[PDB]
């Protein structure tokens, strides 16, 4: 792991000491190589997980998030290359440094053994995101968005610190291997239900729940792009990972402190997908879809079954890839029209007949297409929920219907129709922004060809 996060640190001098004309290239290529060397930790020939030190470990839940975080960086970096091309070189390099800092801190999170390491890094991730959203957003609502996105997190996370501190004072170590093998059943009192809530309602904010999600549209809609990629791809999964790690020390309270959150997730998933059915803003449509997806992950982690954790991991990775892809696809048009309004430009597939295939595949990923790690996750958590209660499929099916609807409606009212003939500024395409979608989709196909990796702790 050290061999993954030291080169990631060396990517920063590589930015600052290189020419202005040979800085995107070098850092992009070397980031791809970091992604390559982040495959050694998929060499798990055994059941025992990979401990490299007291600091760092890597389980089959860590490794996909690690690899995806190392893999997104070149994509963020190339997507961020048309805008801030007319920016001063120092400003460019500051953007690069923030993205690399995100990479490093997120790898450290997913590789951490203790919960306090994970805490300080889970919170250090806020500073790059806030800077990216605020200094490089295009609109004026970015400031309120940053405030929301920061303070929801901090409100949720201060109780988390208090609970971790309590657990240290009670057990002594706060390490995840030892909390696994030494976990006392809880006495089922209010003093422990508050502990459950303090441990959970930091991650549940970040995933997010439907009661608390207003930070995610305001941020996705206003972050330039790369912030949106990350905020859709791994910052939401940074809560699911934490829940999967911390739930082991909360049994048996999860059997009854989970009803409200499963229920909120399910109903609010339906609510969010219905919103996606009727939404003027494309970058908000993607965001509400992300809420409607992560709600299933919430319910799944609450059920704590093998099928459920499995499907949660699958849906995590799949949603991350396809959501980053859809944000790229919307940015591709926003870099020309400079409008997020979707019904503005609605008759493409004449000018962009190849991007319109990436659109289609991105949507089919989004809706439940079977030979895909999206439907595998959605199906397995549907099966877990049916085992839990047979009356949940009534809601999952409504979601499936609406999720076909808003995705196909997006495709239709953006591509299909009559071309907006008043748009002379529809430049043909960028090889860069075609390679982007290819690099988002080719992993989906590969992982569908081999989902033995993309499962989690339980398979």
């Amino acid at each position: 792991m050290l061999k993954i996060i030291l080169p990631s640190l060396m990517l920063l001098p590589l930015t600052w000491l290189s020419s202005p004309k040979k800085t995107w290239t070098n850092v992009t290529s070397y980031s791809f190589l970091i992604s390559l060397t982040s495959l050694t930790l998929l060499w798990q020939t055994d059941e025992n997980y990979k401990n490299f030190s007291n600091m760092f470990s890597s389980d089959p839940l860590s490794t996909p998030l690690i690899i995806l975080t190392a893999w997104l960086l070149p994509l963020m970096l190339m997507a961020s290359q048309n805008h801030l091309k007319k920016d001063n070189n120092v400003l460019q390099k500051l953007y690069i440094s923030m993205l690399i800092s995100l990479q490093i801190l997120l790898i450290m999170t997913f590789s951490a053994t203790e919960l306090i390491m994970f805490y300080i890094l889970f919170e250090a991730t806020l500073i790059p995101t806030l800077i990216i959203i605020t200094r490089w957003g295009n609109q004026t609502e970015r400031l309120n968005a940053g405030i929301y996105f920061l303070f929801y997190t901090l409100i949720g996370s201060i109780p988390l610190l208090i609970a971790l501190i309590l657990i240290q004072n009670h057990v002594g170590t706060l390490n995840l291997m030892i909390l696994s093998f030494t976990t006392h059943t809880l006495d089922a009192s209010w003093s422990n239900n508050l502990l459950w809530l303090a441990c959970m309602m930091a991650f549940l904010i970040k995933m997010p729940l439907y009661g608390v999600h207003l930070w995610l549209p305001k941020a996705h809609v206003e972050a330039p792009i790369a912030g949106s990629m990350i905020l859709a791809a791994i910052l939401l999964k940074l809560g699911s990972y934490g829940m999967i790690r911390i739930s082991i020390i909360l049994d048996p309270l999860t059997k009854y402190m989970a009803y409200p959150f499963i229920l909120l997730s399910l109903w609010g998933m339906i609510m969010t997908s219905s919103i996606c059915l009727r939404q003027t803003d494309l970058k908000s449509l993607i965001a509400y879809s992300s809420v409607s997806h992560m709600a299933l992950v919430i319910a799944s982690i609450m059920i704590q079954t093998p099928w459920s954790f499995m499907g949660a991991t699958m849906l995590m990775i799949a949603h991350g890839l396809t959501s980053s892809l859809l944000f790229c696809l919307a940015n591709s048009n926003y870099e020309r029209i400079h409008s997020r309004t979707m019904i503005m430009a609605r008759g493409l597939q004449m000018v962009f007949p190849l991007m319109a295939t990436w659109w289609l595949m991105a949507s089919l990923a989004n809706l439940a297409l079977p030979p895909s790690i999206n439907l595998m996750g959605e199906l397995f958590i549907t099966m877990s929920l049916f085992s839990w209660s047979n009356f949940t499929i009534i809601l999952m099916g409504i979601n499936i219907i609406i999720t076909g609807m808003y995705s196909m409606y997006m495709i239709i009212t953006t591509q299909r129709g009559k071309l907006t003939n008043h748009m002379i500024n529809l430049q043909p395409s960028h090889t860069r922004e075609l390679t982007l979608m290819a690099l988002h989709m080719i992993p989906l196909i590969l992982l569908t060809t081999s989902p033995k990796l993309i499962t989690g702790l339980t398979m």
């Binding site: 490089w136 957003g137 295009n138 609109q139 004026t140 400079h338």
Partner: peptide, 19 residues
């Protein structure tokens, strides 16, 4: 098209001694 930076109406709210 262009990045938005503040204007005088946005700055004048930080000149009132009490905010």
């Amino acid at each position: 098209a262009r990045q938005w930076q503040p204007d005088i109406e946005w700055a004048e709210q930080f000149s009132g001694a009490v905010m």
